[PDB]
């Protein structure tokens, strides 16, 4: 079927109330997952959303516009496939991966790791990593959470998201051009 092939890695800044986090996305390796996250960011899907789950030395998770822990939708509506890759593992701090409810059930929620966690490999799609704002990630980790719910006690919030490198531009441009041409001369 029709698809949108990325060209290179993507880059997204999360403007949080604790400062700015820069993410590098492995779009060539995880094209569906990168496309989902980029298109959701571009349409302001994450504006005002919180990190609803924070576990020290483990992960911090957000991307749920309902704030409940179980909400959100992919860009396309339906839950979409995992994209596990042998050269992407949860090794080191700041790995960016998708939350899910079982195999091939990705929607909008994502997490960032605080340390290596091999157990997560081949369970959650890794699609990027933090490359800037490590001090901000630390500040986030340091916010106390309710031990019963893992919800941060003071709100950690994404105010805005800037996609500063969108690797789908060339794909989108070809499709838009071809559609425009077809409408103009072969309706």
Residue numbers in the entry: 271 to 457
Which lines from the publication concern this structure?
Cyclophilins are peptidyl-prolyl isomerases (PPIases: EC 5.2.1.8) and are characterized by their ability to catalyze the interconversion of cis and trans isomers of proline. In order to understand the molecular basis of these results, we sought structural coverage of the entire human cyclophilin enzymatic class. We determined crystal structures of seven human PPIase domains—PPIC, PPIE, PPIG, PPWD1, PPIL2, NKTR, and SDCCAG-10. All cyclophilins share a common fold architecture consisting of eight antiparallel β sheets and two α-helices that pack against the sheets. The active site of the cyclophilin family includes the invariant catalytic arginine (Arg55) and a highly conserved mixture of hydrophobic, aromatic, and polar residues including Phe60, Met61, Gln63, Ala101, Phe113, Trp121, Leu122, and His126.
No binding was detected for PPIL2, PPIL6, or SDCCAG-10, making these, to our knowledge, the first set of human cyclophilins that have been found incompetent to ligate cyclosporin. There are no mutational or computational data for the human cyclophilins that have a tyrosine or glutamic acid substitution at the Trp121 position; we therefore made a set of mutants to both PPIA (mutating Trp121 to either tyrosine or glutamic acid) and to PPIL2 (mutating Tyr389 to either tryptophan or histidine). However, the Tyr389 mutation to histidine did not lead to activity as measured by NMR under the experimental conditions assayed. Conversely, a tyrosine modeled in the conformation to coordinate with CsA created a steric clash with the carbonyl of MLE9 (1.75 Å); in addition, there was a close steric conflict with the modeled Tyr residue and Cζ of the highly conserved Phe60 residue that helps form the proline-binding pocket. For PPIL2 and SDCCAG-10, both of which have been found associated with spliceosomal complexes, it may be that it is the non-active surface of the PPIase domain that performs the major function as in the cases of PPIH and PPIL1.
